[PDB]
């Protein structure tokens, strides 16, 4: 079985550009980079995970030097596979950046959005670097929206608007809860999600202490979507608005427990509700 | 008396909840089966094209070689009954769509195998030229 | 009589869904086999391409 | 049952993706291959 | 990568037919058109890579036109299908319609009726959903169903005729919608696979006959279905159609609404059926108002 | 039809490498091995037509060996898979295992991990069900799960890790099974699609932790599941796990059996759960006996 170290050494030797006088006699350096990339891909296949990933990165760099950006993007995706699976999230991120850049330059925005969402997942879950995860979900959603893929765009914007609300960017999250609402009106497949969106929008507007906007969102949802009108989510949002207007945190706690009994509050709703509670209590203390 | 009515209300609440969850799953599955049906259509088209190309390849290779509790229980049963309907038609339509896809996949398998065999034959013939 | 009717419909739907589960298994097996044979097809197509190219160069 | 069905169909999506990609790739190579046999015949004549 | 604009310019220059004295010395113009078509296809492939898809479709249209001038109509049809794909992915439904139409005439002229039927159905979908041209979509589905029926593909023909009958019934065109449902019923008798669809067809037929205020024809449909298909006899669709017929004969719109709700609770009434049942209701109410 | 024995004899004759002085005049021995492999494949096809499946498998093994000698490892992997199929259909599980092992070694070497993982999972199935070599089945499923995790195939990786964890827990490796269930849980969080498997995973994790007499870890697993997955919070599985933890902490085997019966009445305990629950009961009873 060939030794991958020797293959990488041969790839390195072949990957030296012709400099000076021999450049007048040597053909295009593209072929040398192609052969070095092939050697690097072989080494990567034998290693196959971190050493396989590093070997695919070298291959992709040589493919870029050859003018074969195409294979370079594919090879960066392979490097990302190797890195993600080796627990090396940083190199996975780097590989996805290079692959996405190659794709977007080439006019594969769909593939770019796919890997942009994958990148956002790596940023959110493995690196906990939420800001760039928000950025990636937003940009992937935009690229899907250009492609007229409403479902994928909505998935990205659900993630993006949700990371924004947990980061305290409640107004911007509400603006993305609003886009999701318009993109989902009239679509029978999204009816269950639509109620959810209305609720979350109001919650952000309650965490931004704009109870008037929450009331308006409630009225809008009640008027535009009959399924939301009679839903437990609409009643819950109304009760939360009434409690916020009354400055009664204990009542809002009762409402949260009641709603929890019938439809479990997931971590996000608990989190946002806790800030709504804190705002009411802070107003009470300031009035004392 | 009252305790049993309360327990029955709770029963019908969970009953409706589970029915709705089932329906969500069914709708995703039908839409997802439709997406996979479209993909398989693309596969089918490509296989048809390859059949034509392999006819051409065969002839070229040949020549190449030649060269309040009661009311709530009632209403919960109403909503349950609605959802259980949706579950029944969804099951039936799923069986229908999937049966058609089973026959399609059988044909796809046979065509893929035949194309593979033809390509191996022509590659072997080209090796000797 | 309404609720028995409901129970009867749910029982029928469970039967249809058990049938469906058996069918989707048949489908998963078939799809695994088709993936293997489509991989074979792709490899053979590439091999046929390369052999035809080599014959083209030989004849040139 | 509905839940299990959804999961199985989600799983089977992986197979369908690969099959579509491989068959598409195969078709393009076959087309190229036929192109080569055409040029080969043109020369051999 | 070549500049596709330059490729199209070279294609245009090559695509000029030999005029006058030069025609006596120039070979068949077919080869020039073939080369121009190849250039246009190269430009189209470059444009498609760049996803400015409408221009890729335009380049494919030019390629197909040159292929037609070359006498190579089959490649012209293939290229029109490619142009269609580019336009559809680009959101330019009008040019997608035009591309599919040209491909369909090429295919039908060559006796490839099955392929033309496929693209005719797809064209009808583009008309129904993107352009809302329901009349010519009805025409597309009818003709595609006929082409499938000639090819003995009962299933595809039934799919097309279902779409045709649905659109006809929604357009106010009830009687001939019921006729297409009669054809669907006849083509689905005896086939165990279509058993679930068959009940549906009977119901819809009666509904159109109720929307045409022909309660007698709806009743005859009911007895026909009850006698010919035992599964429809004992079904919820049959009982619902009977109840609707009874309400229509009694002139009791509220009874019809109760039956619609009752059937909604056991059978969610899809958008098409809601429209038709509503129409039946206004017909009953109009008769009631005319009697006061 | 040719006699397959005669074909195998000719394959053997051709498969002799050039030795001595003849090696200076004979071309590459690859072609001889290719031709011998072709003869062996012909014999294998003839045996397969006769339903002499084991002989067809043996002929395919010979063909694959010759292909390996020729340098055509990809064809050797294909032929080993064919040999595996012939043996498996013939009830010769041992030779099926050998064929799959050689095929997997080849398919690995050519970078073909997803494929080798499919065949490694199939090997694990043959080991578990036909040969009852549970340890190698555990290794096979772990290996296949890791390779699927390498392809980002979460679903296939989860299937392999489910099998691995189940077999580990049945083998008394409760802690390692709990760790694999932790991996399954983490890989399934937030995915709407696996919610129903997710509840199951939490339960199983606790059960292993109860079989290892670590009730505290079971309580922590219950709390984690209740906090992280709302669908698990209200589930019968969470309440059942809580009840089992309470029974274990109380040293009351009868209450554990009562809870097992109650859970069985509403949600049938499959064989695995019954075995693990019996182990937990046995540990409680052993502690009771040790205290008297």
Residue numbers in the entry:
A (entry chain H): 1 to 48, 53 to 292
B (entry chain L): 433 to 499, 589 to 650
C (entry chain J): 27 to 86
D (entry chain K): 213 to 257
E (entry chain I), F (entry chain G): 1 to 292
Q: What does the primary publication say about this deposited structure?
A:
After fusion, these bundles are disassembled by the AAA+ (ATPase associated with diverse cellular activities) protein Sec18/NSF and its adaptor Sec17/α-SNAP to make them available for subsequent rounds of membrane fusion.
We chose the Sso1–Sec9–Snc1/Snc2 complex (referred to as the ySNARE complex) because each component of this complex crosslinked with high confidence to the D2 domain of Sec18 (Snc1 is highly homologous to Snc2). In the structures of all eight classes, Sso1 is threaded through the D1 pore of Sec18. A characteristic phenylalanine side-chain density in Sso1 is present at the same position relative to Sec18 in all classes, allowing for reliable indexing of Sso1. The nucleotide states and the arrangements of D1 around the substrate were also the same among all eight classes, with the ADP-engaged E protomer forming the top of a spiral staircase of tyrosine residues. Protomers D, B and C were all ATP bound and formed the middle of the staircase. The bottom protomer, A, formed the base of the staircase. Protomer F, with no apparent density for nucleotide in D1, was not associated with Sso1. Given that this charge distribution is replicated between each pair of D2 subdomains around the D2 surface, it is unsurprising that the Habc domain adopts multiple corresponding rotational states over the eight classes, presumably because of the flexible linker that follows it.
